[PDB]
Structure 1
Amino acid sequence: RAYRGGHLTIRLALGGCTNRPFYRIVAAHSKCPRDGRFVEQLGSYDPLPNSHGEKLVALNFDRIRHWIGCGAHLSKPVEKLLGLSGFYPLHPMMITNAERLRRKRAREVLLASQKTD
């Protein structure tokens, strides 16, 4: 529909199943609904691991870099998937979250060590 503003954004459309998510990485308007109209579907992300224990992430890089060079904004999970794939640099939020997880482990090991004695 006609909008007053908005911008092209590569995001994840949560079109899936109950207790079973499945994201469609699409490039849509920022004023459009999540599962609504889009311009062109890029890829697909399966959050749940399959029988082989792999989270299937599918990226159409040839259209992703085209829309990025045309001016498409990116979301935080999209940049996270690109950083995990290696098409984009690793996100500072992923780096700091891994550091925080390491600090939580470093606190829990000392707590479990001081609990036994």
Structure 2
Amino acid sequence: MAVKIKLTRLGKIRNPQYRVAVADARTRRDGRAIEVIGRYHPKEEPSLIEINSERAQYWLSVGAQPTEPVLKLLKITGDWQKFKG
């Protein structure tokens, strides 16, 4: 039971978006997220990122473990690299 960062599929069927959130691995796809930090869209803008990039450093400092796509988003923002720097 460890805190991870998941991408929650929300909205309508064929044009959904992904809510960015910190959550325990033992939760469901749409559970009571600990705190939501931004959003993501797969359409319109190529890899549309809308991330606060403020608390990520905190939650990572606690030890939150993001998944693959989350790492990619963090790298596009530079938050992964800036945090690790």
Say yes or no: TM over 0.5.
yes
Counterpart check, 1:86 vs 2:81: no
- TM-score, normalization: structure 1? 0.63
* Structure with the higher helix share, 1 or 2: 1
Q: Which amino acid aligns with 1:27?
A: V
Residue 68 of structure 1: which of 52, 60, 66 is its match? Answer: 60
Residue 11 of structure 1: which of 1, 6, 20 is its match? Answer: 6
Name the residue aligned to 1:110.
none
Residue 32 of structure 1: which of 27, 38, 41 is its match? Answer: 27
Alpha-carbon deviation of 1:55?
Answer: 4.5
* Count of residues in Structure 1 that have an aligned counterpart in Structure 2: 81
CA distance in 1, matches of 2:68, 2:47: 18
Structure with the greater alpha carbon radius of gyration:
1
Alpha-carbon deviation of 1:45?
Answer: 0.2
- When the two chains are superposed, the root-mean-square deviation of aligned CA atoms in Å is 1.5
Alpha-carbon deviation of 1:82?
Answer: 1.1
- Counterparts of 1:51-66 in structure 2, within 5 Å, are 53=45, 55-66=47-58
Q: Which amino acid aligns with 2:54?
A: D
Structure 2 residue runs of 5 or longer lacking an equivalent are: none
Q: Which amino acid aligns with 2:12?
A: C
Determine what percentage of the aligned residue pairs are the same residue: 33
